[PDB]
């Protein structure tokens, strides 16, 4: 459990998007005061073996934490995402909920697939019959208000 979260901060903090020095929610909320439209995760106090992330929206800033299940990492307790393997990359699977998937936008150099004049075409690139469905939003104590968040924090 803790080892999974801690091992994630090591790789997550190396990105620079992790700012360790603020408060639980106050750390994530600072993204709204500086990197507007950006979400960041802070290292929960206590033993410092846990991190919580929150985003900014027109409905209010919300913070969420990952839950360790036996040997798996998930932002909840429902195994509705066993696509990967057991004990896979802890927060990495959770990061998809806090942000978009990895894989920089760069790719060698040449456009493996050009998209010039090509009408009547199914825009399905990375979707070979595989989609765990992702989305981050706040619940109105009764109404699920879906919010789309996917912006990395870049210092400043």
């Amino acid at each position: 459990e803790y080892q999974l979260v801690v091992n994630a901060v090591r790789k997550l903090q190396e990105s620079g998007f992790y700012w360790s020095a603020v408060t639980g929610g106050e750390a994530n909320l600072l993204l709204s005061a500086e990197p507007a439209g950006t979400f960041l995760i802070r290292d929960s106090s206590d033993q410092r073996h846990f991190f919580t992330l929150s985003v900014k929206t027109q409905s209010g800033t919300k913070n969420l934490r990952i839950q360790c299940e036996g040997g798996s990492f998930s932002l909840q307790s429902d195994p509705r995402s066993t696509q990967p393997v057991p004990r896979f990359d802890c927060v990495l699977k959770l990061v998809h909920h806090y942000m978009p998937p990895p894989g920089t936008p760069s790719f060698s150099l040449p456009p493996t697939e050009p998209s010039s004049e090509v009408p009547e075409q199914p825009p399905a690139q990375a979707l070979p019959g595989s989609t765990p469905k992702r989305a981050y939003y706040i619940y109105s104590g009764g109404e699920k208000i879906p919010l789309v968040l996917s912006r990395p924090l870049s210092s400043n």
Binding site: G24, Q76, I138, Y139, K144
Partner: peptide, 15 residues
Amino acid sequence: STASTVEYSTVVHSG
């Protein structure tokens, strides 16, 4: 409130 601040709920539970 100077104390409880890291409050929240969850995101897209299931469907």
